[PDB]
Coordinates of C-alpha atoms and ligand atoms in Angstrom, one line a residue:
Chain A
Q4 CA 0.0 0.0 0.0
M5 CA 1.6 3.3 -1.2
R6 CA 1.0 6.8 0.3
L7 CA 0.0 9.5 -2.2
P8 CA -0.4 13.2 -1.5
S9 CA -3.7 14.9 -0.4
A10 CA -6.4 15.5 -3.0
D11 CA -6.3 19.1 -1.7
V12 CA -2.8 19.5 -3.2
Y13 CA -2.9 16.8 -6.0
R14 CA -6.4 16.3 -7.6
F15 CA -5.5 12.8 -9.1
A16 CA -4.7 11.3 -5.6
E17 CA -8.5 11.1 -4.8
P18 CA -9.4 7.4 -4.3
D19 CA -11.8 5.6 -6.7
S20 CA -15.6 5.4 -5.8
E21 CA -19.0 4.9 -7.6
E22 CA -19.2 8.7 -7.5
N23 CA -16.1 9.2 -9.8
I24 CA -15.3 6.0 -11.8
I25 CA -17.2 2.8 -12.9
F26 CA -16.4 -0.2 -15.1
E27 CA -17.9 -2.7 -17.4
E28 CA -18.1 -6.4 -16.3
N29 CA -15.7 -7.5 -19.1
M30 CA -11.8 -7.0 -19.4
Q31 CA -9.5 -5.9 -22.3
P32 CA -9.6 -9.0 -24.6
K33 CA -5.7 -9.3 -25.0
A34 CA -4.5 -7.3 -22.0
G35 CA -6.5 -8.2 -18.8
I36 CA -7.1 -4.4 -18.1
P37 CA -10.5 -3.4 -16.8
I38 CA -12.8 -1.5 -19.2
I39 CA -13.8 2.0 -18.1
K40 CA -17.6 2.6 -18.6
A41 CA -17.7 6.1 -17.2
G42 CA -15.8 8.5 -14.9
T43 CA -14.9 12.1 -14.2
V44 CA -12.4 13.9 -16.4
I45 CA -9.8 13.7 -13.5
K46 CA -10.3 9.9 -13.1
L47 CA -10.2 9.5 -17.0
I48 CA -6.9 11.5 -17.1
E49 CA -5.6 9.5 -14.1
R50 CA -6.2 6.2 -16.0
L51 CA -4.8 7.7 -19.3
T52 CA -1.5 8.2 -17.4
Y53 CA -2.0 5.3 -14.8
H54 CA 1.1 4.2 -12.8
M55 CA 0.4 0.4 -12.5
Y56 CA 0.2 -0.3 -16.2
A57 CA 0.2 1.3 -19.7
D58 CA -3.2 1.3 -21.4
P59 CA -2.6 1.9 -25.2
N60 CA -6.2 1.1 -26.2
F61 CA -7.6 3.6 -23.8
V62 CA -5.1 6.2 -25.0
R63 CA -5.8 5.5 -28.6
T64 CA -9.6 5.7 -27.9
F65 CA -9.4 8.8 -25.7
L66 CA -7.3 11.0 -28.1
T67 CA -9.8 10.1 -30.9
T68 CA -12.9 11.0 -29.0
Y69 CA -12.1 13.4 -26.1
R70 CA -13.2 16.7 -27.9
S71 CA -16.9 16.1 -26.9
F72 CA -16.2 16.2 -23.2
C73 CA -12.9 18.2 -22.9
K74 CA -11.2 21.0 -25.0
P75 CA -7.7 20.5 -26.4
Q76 CA -6.4 23.4 -24.3
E77 CA -8.1 21.9 -21.2
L78 CA -6.6 18.4 -21.9
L79 CA -3.0 19.9 -22.1
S80 CA -3.6 21.6 -18.8
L81 CA -4.8 18.4 -17.2
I82 CA -1.8 16.4 -18.4
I83 CA 0.6 19.1 -17.3
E84 CA -1.2 19.1 -13.9
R85 CA -0.8 15.3 -13.8
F86 CA 3.0 15.5 -14.5
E87 CA 3.7 18.2 -11.9
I88 CA 3.4 15.7 -8.9
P89 CA 4.1 16.9 -5.4
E90 CA 5.7 14.6 -2.8
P91 CA 3.5 13.5 0.3
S109 CA 13.6 7.5 3.1
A110 CA 12.0 4.1 2.1
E111 CA 8.6 5.6 1.1
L112 CA 10.0 8.7 -0.7
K113 CA 12.4 6.6 -2.9
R114 CA 9.7 4.0 -3.7
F115 CA 7.1 6.7 -4.6
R116 CA 9.6 8.3 -7.0
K117 CA 10.2 5.0 -8.8
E118 CA 6.7 3.4 -8.5
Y119 CA 4.5 6.6 -9.0
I120 CA 6.2 9.8 -10.2
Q121 CA 8.5 8.3 -12.9
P122 CA 5.9 5.9 -14.4
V123 CA 3.1 8.7 -14.4
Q124 CA 5.5 11.2 -16.0
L125 CA 6.4 8.7 -18.7
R126 CA 2.7 8.0 -19.4
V127 CA 2.0 11.8 -19.7
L128 CA 4.9 11.9 -22.3
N129 CA 3.4 9.0 -24.2
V130 CA 0.0 10.9 -24.4
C131 CA 1.9 13.9 -25.7
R132 CA 3.8 11.8 -28.3
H133 CA 0.7 10.0 -29.4
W134 CA -1.4 13.2 -29.6
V135 CA 1.2 15.0 -31.8
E136 CA 1.8 11.9 -34.0
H137 CA -1.9 10.9 -34.6
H138 CA -4.0 14.1 -33.9
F139 CA -1.7 17.0 -35.0
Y140 CA -4.9 18.8 -36.3
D141 CA -5.5 20.0 -32.8
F142 CA -2.2 21.9 -33.0
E143 CA -2.6 23.1 -36.7
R144 CA -5.9 24.7 -35.7
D145 CA -4.6 26.2 -32.4
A146 CA -1.0 27.5 -32.6
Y147 CA -1.2 28.6 -28.9
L148 CA -1.9 24.9 -28.1
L149 CA 1.4 24.0 -29.9
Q150 CA 3.0 27.0 -28.0
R151 CA 2.0 25.5 -24.6
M152 CA 3.0 21.9 -25.8
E153 CA 6.5 23.0 -27.0
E154 CA 7.0 25.0 -23.7
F155 CA 6.0 22.1 -21.5
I156 CA 8.2 19.7 -23.4
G157 CA 11.1 22.2 -23.0
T158 CA 10.7 22.3 -19.2
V159 CA 10.9 18.4 -19.0
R160 CA 14.3 17.3 -17.5
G161 CA 16.1 14.1 -16.3
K162 CA 17.4 10.8 -17.7
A163 CA 14.6 8.5 -19.0
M164 CA 12.6 11.6 -20.1
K165 CA 15.3 13.1 -22.6
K166 CA 14.8 10.1 -24.9
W167 CA 10.9 10.8 -25.2
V168 CA 11.3 14.6 -25.1
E169 CA 13.7 14.4 -28.1
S170 CA 11.3 12.0 -30.0
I171 CA 8.3 14.3 -29.3
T172 CA 10.5 17.3 -30.6
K173 CA 11.3 15.4 -33.8
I174 CA 7.6 14.6 -34.4
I175 CA 6.5 18.2 -33.8
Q176 CA 9.0 19.5 -36.4
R177 CA 8.2 16.7 -38.9
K178 CA 4.5 17.7 -38.6
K179 CA 5.4 21.4 -39.1
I180 CA 7.5 20.4 -42.3
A181 CA 4.4 18.8 -44.0
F192 CA 5.3 -1.6 -53.1
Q193 CA 4.2 -4.8 -55.1
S194 CA 4.9 -6.8 -58.3
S195 CA 3.8 -5.5 -61.8
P196 CA 0.1 -4.4 -62.2
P197 CA -2.1 -5.6 -65.1
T198 CA -1.9 -4.1 -68.6
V199 CA -4.2 -1.1 -69.1
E200 CA -7.2 -2.1 -71.3
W201 CA -8.5 0.0 -74.4
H202 CA -11.6 -0.6 -76.5
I203 CA -12.8 1.9 -79.2
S204 CA -11.2 5.0 -77.6
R205 CA -7.4 5.1 -78.1
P206 CA -4.8 6.3 -75.7
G207 CA -4.7 10.1 -75.7
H208 CA -8.0 10.5 -77.6
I209 CA -9.9 12.0 -74.6
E210 CA -12.6 13.6 -76.9
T211 CA -14.1 10.2 -77.7
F212 CA -14.1 8.9 -74.1
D213 CA -17.5 7.7 -73.0
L214 CA -19.3 4.8 -71.3
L215 CA -19.3 2.6 -74.4
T216 CA -16.0 3.7 -75.9
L217 CA -13.7 3.2 -72.9
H218 CA -13.0 -0.5 -72.0
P219 CA -15.4 -1.6 -69.3
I220 CA -12.5 -3.2 -67.3
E221 CA -10.6 0.1 -67.3
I222 CA -13.8 2.1 -66.4
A223 CA -14.1 -0.1 -63.2
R224 CA -10.4 0.0 -62.4
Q225 CA -9.9 3.7 -62.8
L226 CA -13.1 4.4 -60.8
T227 CA -11.9 1.9 -58.1
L228 CA -8.6 3.8 -58.0
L229 CA -10.4 7.2 -57.5
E230 CA -12.8 5.8 -55.0
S231 CA -10.0 4.0 -53.1
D232 CA -8.1 7.3 -52.7
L233 CA -11.3 9.2 -51.7
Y234 CA -12.1 6.5 -49.1
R235 CA -8.4 6.6 -47.7
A236 CA -8.4 10.3 -47.2
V237 CA -11.3 10.4 -44.7
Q238 CA -10.0 10.9 -41.2
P239 CA -11.7 10.3 -37.8
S240 CA -11.7 14.1 -37.2
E241 CA -14.3 14.3 -39.9
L242 CA -16.6 11.6 -38.3
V243 CA -16.2 11.9 -34.5
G244 CA -19.0 14.2 -33.1
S245 CA -21.2 13.5 -36.2
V246 CA -19.7 16.8 -37.6
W247 CA -20.6 15.9 -41.3
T248 CA -24.3 16.5 -40.4
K249 CA -23.7 19.8 -38.6
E250 CA -23.8 23.4 -40.1
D251 CA -19.9 23.5 -40.5
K252 CA -19.7 20.1 -42.4
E253 CA -18.0 21.7 -45.4
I254 CA -15.2 22.9 -43.0
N255 CA -15.0 19.8 -40.8
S256 CA -15.7 16.9 -43.3
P257 CA -14.3 18.0 -46.6
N258 CA -12.8 14.7 -47.7
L259 CA -15.9 12.7 -46.8
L260 CA -18.2 15.1 -48.7
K261 CA -16.0 14.9 -51.9
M262 CA -16.1 11.1 -51.6
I263 CA -20.0 11.1 -51.2
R264 CA -20.3 13.6 -54.1
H265 CA -18.2 11.4 -56.5
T266 CA -20.4 8.4 -55.6
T267 CA -23.5 10.6 -56.2
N268 CA -22.1 12.0 -59.5
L269 CA -21.3 8.5 -60.8
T270 CA -24.9 7.2 -60.0
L271 CA -26.3 10.2 -61.8
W272 CA -24.0 9.7 -64.8
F273 CA -25.2 6.1 -65.1
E274 CA -28.8 7.1 -64.9
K275 CA -28.3 9.9 -67.5
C276 CA -26.4 7.5 -69.9
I277 CA -29.4 5.2 -69.7
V278 CA -32.3 7.5 -70.1
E279 CA -30.6 9.8 -72.6
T280 CA -30.1 6.7 -74.9
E281 CA -33.5 6.9 -76.5
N282 CA -33.0 4.1 -79.0
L283 CA -34.0 0.8 -77.3
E284 CA -31.2 -1.4 -78.8
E285 CA -28.5 1.2 -77.8
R286 CA -30.1 1.6 -74.4
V287 CA -29.9 -2.2 -73.9
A288 CA -26.2 -1.9 -74.8
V289 CA -25.8 0.8 -72.1
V290 CA -27.5 -1.2 -69.3
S291 CA -25.6 -4.3 -70.2
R292 CA -22.2 -2.3 -70.2
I293 CA -23.0 -0.8 -66.7
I294 CA -23.7 -4.4 -65.4
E295 CA -20.3 -5.5 -66.9
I296 CA -18.6 -2.6 -65.0
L297 CA -20.5 -3.7 -61.8
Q298 CA -19.1 -7.3 -62.3
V299 CA -15.6 -5.9 -62.3
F300 CA -16.3 -3.7 -59.2
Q301 CA -17.4 -7.0 -57.5
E302 CA -14.2 -8.7 -58.7
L303 CA -12.2 -5.7 -57.3
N304 CA -14.2 -5.6 -54.0
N305 CA -15.2 -1.9 -54.7
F306 CA -18.5 -2.0 -52.8
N307 CA -18.8 1.7 -53.1
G308 CA -18.8 1.3 -56.9
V309 CA -21.2 -1.7 -56.6
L310 CA -23.7 0.5 -54.8
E311 CA -23.2 3.4 -57.3
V312 CA -24.6 1.0 -59.9
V313 CA -27.2 -0.6 -57.7
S314 CA -28.5 2.9 -56.7
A315 CA -28.7 4.0 -60.4
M316 CA -30.7 0.9 -61.2
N317 CA -33.2 1.3 -58.3
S318 CA -33.8 5.0 -59.3
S319 CA -37.2 6.0 -60.5
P320 CA -36.1 6.9 -64.0
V321 CA -34.1 3.6 -64.5
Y322 CA -36.1 1.0 -62.5
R323 CA -39.3 1.5 -64.7
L324 CA -37.7 0.7 -68.1
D325 CA -39.2 -2.8 -68.6
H326 CA -38.7 -2.9 -72.4
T327 CA -34.9 -2.5 -71.7
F328 CA -34.7 -5.2 -69.1
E329 CA -36.7 -7.7 -71.2
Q330 CA -33.7 -7.7 -73.7
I331 CA -31.0 -8.0 -71.0
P332 CA -29.2 -11.4 -70.9
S333 CA -30.0 -13.6 -67.8
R334 CA -26.3 -13.9 -66.8
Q335 CA -26.4 -10.1 -66.3
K336 CA -29.8 -10.1 -64.6
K337 CA -28.4 -12.6 -62.1
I338 CA -25.3 -10.4 -61.6
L339 CA -27.5 -7.4 -60.8
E340 CA -29.8 -9.5 -58.6
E341 CA -26.9 -10.6 -56.4
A342 CA -25.4 -7.0 -56.2
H343 CA -28.9 -5.7 -55.3
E344 CA -29.3 -8.3 -52.6
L345 CA -26.2 -7.1 -50.8
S346 CA -28.4 -4.1 -49.7
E347 CA -31.5 -6.0 -48.9
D348 CA -32.4 -6.6 -45.2
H349 CA -30.3 -3.7 -43.8
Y350 CA -27.1 -4.6 -45.7
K351 CA -27.0 -8.2 -44.2
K352 CA -25.1 -9.8 -47.1
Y353 CA -22.9 -6.7 -47.6
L354 CA -21.8 -6.9 -44.0
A355 CA -21.3 -10.6 -44.2
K356 CA -19.3 -10.2 -47.5
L357 CA -17.1 -7.4 -46.3
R358 CA -16.0 -9.4 -43.2
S359 CA -15.2 -12.4 -45.5
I360 CA -13.0 -10.5 -47.9
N361 CA -9.5 -9.1 -47.3
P362 CA -7.9 -5.8 -48.5
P363 CA -7.7 -4.0 -50.9
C364 CA -11.3 -3.1 -50.9
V365 CA -13.4 0.1 -51.1
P366 CA -16.2 -0.2 -48.5
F367 CA -19.5 1.6 -48.7
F368 CA -19.3 4.5 -46.1
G369 CA -23.0 5.1 -45.5
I370 CA -23.3 2.3 -43.0
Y371 CA -20.5 3.7 -40.8
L372 CA -22.0 7.2 -40.9
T373 CA -25.4 5.9 -39.7
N374 CA -23.9 3.8 -37.0
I375 CA -21.7 6.6 -35.7
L376 CA -24.6 9.1 -35.7
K377 CA -27.0 6.8 -34.0
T378 CA -24.4 5.8 -31.4
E379 CA -23.8 9.5 -30.5
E380 CA -27.5 10.4 -30.6
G381 CA -28.8 7.2 -29.0
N382 CA -26.6 7.3 -25.8
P383 CA -26.1 9.9 -23.1
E384 CA -23.1 12.1 -22.9
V385 CA -23.2 11.7 -19.1
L386 CA -24.3 9.1 -16.6
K387 CA -25.2 10.1 -13.0
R388 CA -24.1 8.0 -10.0
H389 CA -25.1 9.1 -6.5
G390 CA -26.0 12.5 -8.0
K391 CA -22.5 13.1 -9.6
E392 CA -22.0 13.4 -13.4
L393 CA -19.7 10.8 -15.0
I394 CA -18.6 11.2 -18.6
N395 CA -20.0 8.2 -20.5
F396 CA -16.7 6.9 -22.0
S397 CA -18.3 3.6 -23.4
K398 CA -20.3 5.7 -25.9
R399 CA -17.0 7.1 -27.1
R400 CA -15.3 3.7 -27.3
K401 CA -18.2 2.4 -29.4
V402 CA -17.6 5.3 -31.9
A403 CA -13.9 4.7 -31.9
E404 CA -14.5 1.0 -32.7
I405 CA -16.3 2.1 -35.9
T406 CA -13.6 4.7 -36.8
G407 CA -11.0 1.9 -36.3
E408 CA -13.1 -0.5 -38.5
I409 CA -12.9 2.3 -41.3
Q410 CA -9.1 2.6 -40.9
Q411 CA -8.4 -1.1 -41.2
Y412 CA -9.4 -0.9 -44.9
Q413 CA -7.4 2.4 -45.6
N414 CA -4.0 0.7 -45.2
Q415 CA -3.8 -1.5 -48.3
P416 CA -3.7 0.0 -51.9
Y417 CA -4.7 -1.6 -55.2
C418 CA -2.2 -3.1 -57.6
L419 CA -3.6 -1.3 -60.7
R420 CA -1.9 1.4 -63.0
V421 CA -3.4 4.9 -63.1
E422 CA -4.4 6.2 -66.6
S423 CA -4.2 10.0 -66.1
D424 CA -6.7 10.8 -69.0
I425 CA -9.3 8.2 -67.9
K426 CA -8.8 9.4 -64.3
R427 CA -9.4 13.0 -65.2
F428 CA -12.4 12.1 -67.4
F429 CA -14.2 10.6 -64.2
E430 CA -12.9 13.4 -61.9
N431 CA -14.5 16.1 -64.1
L432 CA -17.8 14.2 -64.8
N433 CA -20.7 16.7 -64.2
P434 CA -24.0 15.0 -65.3
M435 CA -26.1 17.7 -63.5
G436 CA -24.3 20.6 -65.3
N437 CA -25.7 23.9 -63.9
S438 CA -29.0 22.4 -62.8
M439 CA -30.2 21.9 -59.3
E440 CA -31.1 18.4 -57.9
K441 CA -34.9 18.8 -58.4
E442 CA -34.6 20.3 -61.9
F443 CA -32.2 17.4 -63.0
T444 CA -34.0 14.6 -61.2
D445 CA -37.3 15.6 -63.0
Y446 CA -35.5 15.9 -66.4
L447 CA -34.2 12.3 -65.8
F448 CA -37.7 11.1 -65.0
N449 CA -39.4 12.9 -67.8
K450 CA -36.8 11.4 -70.1
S451 CA -37.7 7.9 -68.7
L452 CA -41.4 8.6 -69.5
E453 CA -40.6 9.9 -73.0
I454 CA -38.5 6.8 -74.0
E455 CA -40.8 4.3 -72.4
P456 CA -44.3 5.8 -71.8
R457 CA -46.6 4.7 -69.0
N458 CA -49.0 1.9 -70.1
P459 CA -51.1 1.5 -72.2
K460 CA -49.2 4.1 -74.4
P461 CA -47.4 2.3 -77.3
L462 CA -43.6 2.1 -77.3
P463 CA -42.2 4.7 -79.8
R464 CA -39.0 4.2 -81.8
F465 CA -36.1 6.6 -81.7
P466 CA -33.1 7.1 -83.9
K467 CA -29.7 5.6 -83.1
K468 CA -27.1 8.1 -81.7
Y469 CA -23.9 5.9 -81.7
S470 CA -21.8 5.8 -84.9
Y471 CA -19.5 3.2 -83.3
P472 CA -20.3 -0.5 -82.7
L473 CA -22.3 -1.5 -79.5
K474 CA -20.6 -4.9 -78.9
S475 CA -18.8 -5.1 -75.6
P476 CA -15.2 -6.4 -75.5
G477 CA -16.1 -8.3 -72.3
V478 CA -14.9 -8.3 -68.7
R479 CA -12.0 -10.8 -69.3
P480 CA -8.6 -9.3 -70.0
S481 CA -7.2 -9.2 -73.5
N482 CA -3.4 -9.7 -72.7
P483 CA -1.6 -11.8 -70.1
Chain B
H19 CA -46.1 -16.1 -40.1
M20 CA -47.0 -12.8 -38.2
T21 CA -47.4 -9.6 -40.3
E22 CA -44.2 -7.7 -40.8
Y23 CA -44.4 -3.9 -41.7
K24 CA -41.5 -2.5 -43.7
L25 CA -41.4 1.2 -42.5
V26 CA -39.0 3.9 -43.9
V27 CA -38.0 7.1 -42.1
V28 CA -37.4 10.1 -44.5
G29 CA -36.5 13.6 -43.5
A30 CA -33.9 16.3 -43.4
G31 CA -30.5 15.7 -41.7
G32 CA -28.8 17.6 -39.0
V33 CA -32.0 18.1 -36.9
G34 CA -32.2 14.9 -34.7
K35 CA -34.5 12.7 -36.9
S36 CA -32.8 9.6 -35.5
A37 CA -34.5 10.2 -32.1
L38 CA -37.9 9.0 -33.3
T39 CA -36.9 5.4 -34.0
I40 CA -34.2 5.2 -31.3
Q41 CA -36.8 6.1 -28.7
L42 CA -39.3 3.6 -30.2
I43 CA -36.9 0.6 -30.1
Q44 CA -35.3 1.7 -26.8
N45 CA -37.2 -0.3 -24.1
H46 CA -38.2 2.7 -22.0
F47 CA -35.9 3.0 -18.9
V48 CA -32.9 1.8 -21.0
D49 CA -30.4 4.3 -22.6
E50 CA -27.7 1.9 -23.9
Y51 CA -28.4 1.9 -27.7
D52 CA -26.3 -0.1 -30.2
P53 CA -27.2 0.4 -33.9
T54 CA -25.0 -2.5 -35.1
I55 CA -27.4 -5.3 -34.0
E56 CA -30.7 -6.6 -35.6
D57 CA -33.0 -5.8 -32.6
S58 CA -32.0 -2.1 -32.9
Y59 CA -34.4 -1.7 -36.0
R60 CA -37.0 -4.5 -35.3
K61 CA -39.8 -4.5 -32.7
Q62 CA -42.7 -6.8 -32.0
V63 CA -45.7 -4.7 -31.1
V64 CA -49.4 -5.2 -30.5
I65 CA -51.5 -2.6 -32.4
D66 CA -55.3 -2.8 -32.0
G67 CA -54.8 -6.3 -30.5
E68 CA -53.2 -7.6 -33.7
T69 CA -49.5 -8.5 -33.1
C70 CA -47.0 -7.5 -35.8
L71 CA -43.3 -6.9 -36.3
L72 CA -42.1 -3.4 -37.4
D73 CA -38.9 -3.3 -39.4
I74 CA -37.8 0.4 -39.5
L75 CA -35.2 1.8 -42.0
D76 CA -33.6 5.0 -40.8
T77 CA -30.7 6.1 -42.9
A78 CA -29.9 9.0 -40.6
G79 CA -26.4 10.3 -41.6
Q80 CA -26.5 9.3 -45.3
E81 CA -28.3 12.5 -46.6
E82 CA -25.4 13.4 -48.9
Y83 CA -26.0 10.1 -50.8
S84 CA -28.9 11.9 -52.4
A85 CA -29.0 9.4 -55.4
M86 CA -29.6 6.5 -52.9
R87 CA -33.0 7.8 -51.6
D88 CA -34.9 5.9 -54.3
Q89 CA -33.1 2.6 -53.4
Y90 CA -34.0 3.1 -49.7
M91 CA -37.6 4.4 -50.2
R92 CA -38.4 1.5 -52.6
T93 CA -38.0 -1.0 -49.7
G94 CA -40.9 0.4 -47.7
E95 CA -44.7 0.1 -47.5
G96 CA -45.1 3.0 -45.1
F97 CA -43.2 6.2 -44.5
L98 CA -42.7 8.6 -41.7
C99 CA -41.9 12.0 -43.2
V100 CA -40.0 13.7 -40.4
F101 CA -39.2 17.4 -39.9
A102 CA -38.0 19.4 -36.8
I103 CA -40.4 21.9 -35.3
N104 CA -37.3 24.4 -34.7
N105 CA -36.2 24.2 -38.4
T106 CA -38.4 25.6 -41.1
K107 CA -36.1 24.3 -44.0
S108 CA -36.7 20.7 -42.8
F109 CA -40.5 21.5 -42.9
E110 CA -40.3 23.0 -46.4
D111 CA -38.3 19.9 -47.6
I112 CA -41.3 17.6 -46.9
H113 CA -43.1 18.5 -50.1
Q114 CA -40.2 16.9 -52.1
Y115 CA -39.8 13.8 -49.9
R116 CA -43.4 13.0 -50.5
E117 CA -43.1 13.7 -54.2
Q118 CA -40.2 11.2 -54.4
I119 CA -42.0 8.5 -52.3
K120 CA -45.1 8.9 -54.7
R121 CA -42.7 8.6 -57.7
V122 CA -40.8 5.6 -56.3
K123 CA -44.1 3.7 -55.4
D124 CA -45.9 4.8 -58.6
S125 CA -48.9 5.8 -56.4
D126 CA -50.6 9.0 -55.2
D127 CA -52.0 7.0 -52.2
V128 CA -49.0 5.8 -50.3
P129 CA -49.4 4.9 -46.5
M130 CA -47.7 7.9 -45.0
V131 CA -47.6 10.0 -41.9
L132 CA -46.2 13.5 -41.1
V133 CA -44.0 13.7 -38.0
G134 CA -43.0 17.0 -36.3
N135 CA -40.1 16.2 -34.0
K136 CA -39.2 18.5 -31.0
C137 CA -35.4 17.6 -31.0
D138 CA -34.3 20.3 -28.5
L139 CA -35.4 23.2 -26.4
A140 CA -34.5 25.7 -29.2
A141 CA -37.5 27.9 -30.3
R142 CA -40.4 26.5 -32.3
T143 CA -40.4 28.0 -35.8
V144 CA -43.1 25.7 -37.2
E145 CA -46.6 26.1 -35.6
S146 CA -48.7 23.0 -35.3
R147 CA -51.4 24.7 -37.4
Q148 CA -49.0 25.0 -40.4
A149 CA -48.2 21.3 -40.1
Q150 CA -51.8 20.2 -39.5
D151 CA -52.7 22.3 -42.7
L152 CA -49.9 20.7 -44.8
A153 CA -50.8 17.2 -43.6
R154 CA -54.5 17.9 -44.5
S155 CA -53.6 19.2 -48.0
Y156 CA -51.9 15.8 -48.7
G157 CA -54.5 13.8 -46.8
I158 CA -52.3 12.2 -44.2
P159 CA -52.0 12.2 -40.3
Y160 CA -49.9 14.7 -38.4
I161 CA -48.1 13.5 -35.2
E162 CA -45.9 15.7 -33.0
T163 CA -43.1 14.0 -30.9
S164 CA -40.7 14.9 -28.2
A165 CA -37.1 13.6 -28.4
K166 CA -36.6 14.0 -24.6
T167 CA -39.9 12.7 -23.2
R168 CA -40.8 10.0 -25.7
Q169 CA -44.2 11.6 -26.1
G170 CA -45.9 10.8 -29.4
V171 CA -43.4 8.2 -30.6
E172 CA -45.7 5.2 -30.3
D173 CA -48.6 7.2 -31.8
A174 CA -46.5 8.2 -34.8
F175 CA -45.5 4.6 -35.6
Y176 CA -48.9 3.0 -34.6
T177 CA -50.7 5.6 -36.7
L178 CA -48.7 4.5 -39.8
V179 CA -49.4 0.8 -39.3
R180 CA -53.1 1.8 -39.2
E181 CA -52.6 3.8 -42.5
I182 CA -51.1 0.6 -44.1
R183 CA -53.8 -1.7 -42.7
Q184 CA -56.6 0.6 -43.8
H185 CA -55.1 1.2 -47.3
Ligands
DXO501 C1 -31.2 -6.8 -65.4 S1 -32.9 -7.1 -65.8 C2 -33.7 -6.3 -64.5 N1 -33.1 -5.9 -63.4 C3 -33.8 -5.4 -62.4 C4 -33.2 -4.9 -61.2 C5 -32.7 -5.7 -60.2 C6 -32.7 -7.2 -60.4 C7 -32.2 -5.2 -59.0 C8 -32.1 -3.8 -58.8 C9 -32.6 -3.0 -59.8 C10 -33.2 -3.5 -61.0 C11 -33.7 -2.5 -62.0 N2 -35.2 -5.3 -62.4 C12 -35.7 -5.8 -63.6 N3 -37.1 -5.7 -63.7 C13 -37.8 -4.6 -63.0 C14 -39.2 -5.0 -62.7 N4 -39.9 -5.4 -63.9 C15 -39.2 -6.5 -64.5 C16 -37.8 -6.2 -64.9 N5 -35.1 -6.3 -64.6

């Protein structure tokens, strides 16, 4: 039993009670550490920099989700307060080795981790970085110098700011460099899928937890706080709209059958590549009111492709049951569909209290924050691995600059798409009209199987 | 085989729409919600002494995926068109949600309900009379709910099941 100073002098000395810290029945799966359910900010900071053992999971979780219950400037103050330990012989030499030195090292680990993985707090508050550099400068002694130097190297790096050969790029009617002829039917359907998988893979990888924690993509400053997520969602939306537009603007039935068939071939390749974002871009285009109603077009579609579309659609049925099952079964590289994560993070934050009350005292609900960090961690596990596919700068640029809406607002474009659907395939009993062909080039697909070894 | 009602929540984002379904499913006196499990969106209820299962789709958070609304709406028989009583833009947006639902279902008579959600203690900008009037012009019920007290949540959902049953 070790003697710690009075809570009147050192706030983190106060003993544990139901009024300041509570736990879950389970223990850390691989570490045997108890799981904190809720506690006061002091008790959470005490356990972040605990003397008996290091708690990397709790540190990793905390620094991701603390901004709801504590400001960066307030966290720094708390960890500086924790480091500056007063004393309360045998007891005084033991306390120094078993309490002060371990706690001081744990505060420096927090600092190091914060700076390494959440430098945005410092980019957005230069005085926060001022106080952090100052504190680090005051740190002295052997054992600390090693960490103080490593932290100083990270700060300055943050201020400064791998496989075998990939497959051969595929070409169909459009030739390399002839960007003016690039379209859905002229580019090779394998390369449309690959180049879109490459854009969508980079977009997915760029989303950071700072854009998700606190459900900030749904708030008034979402354009400021969640820019990479929003670009990602907008590419996906642009691609769905382009697929719908390609379909309904192809008024000739035989050419429109060629268009739906080519989109299904692209979907097949997205399924091969595990680009589930791309799979849903296609599924969403097909379930849209302008596309879903085109029964004369679907009548002429080969059964192989119908079945391909049926399976892709079924990944979404029953609250994404099969999608979830399929994502767990595959291994990277893949491009997950982000929408599920966004709904689960939102509903976790909105469906659980920020605070629990025990014996009339407010405890920060940390388990709510852990649950969010589990989802942000799940998103990060698929951001590590890249695709072994070559970029084609012209095809890339063609998809980056797609603008099916043009200068029209959503409603105006959405109605244009639907009124086009009604024009090309009128509501029964109206007879099916015939429309002239618009494609000079041949409609036969080259297939989804590569041409060269 | 008991009857299963496939319900869809549609409404503006950023205004606490998720509270409606969360509060429904949350066994009152339990505030430990987990959206990742099956029981989080399914609930066995007894409406007018006829037991049924309610499957609720709430895509709260995916509003930027504007081209996925048709995919999602297409899965439902009934719809709760939700707006916040402190946000006039979320109220003004109902006319288009209804227009899309009608267009997705190829019907002018879709089992549908209008829900006015009191998501916080910010000021009311949408008077009940405006909403009752809007709901009347469309020919659908109007239910007001509280996100804190759980008042009106059962009524909103049970009224929709009745609209489907009486269709
Ligand atoms: C590939 S042939 C096809 N595909 C689909 C379809 C499927 C199977 C899933 C999602 C969206 C759509 C449009 N639906 C239909 N039908 C729509 C309903 N009427 C019969 C055709 N045909």
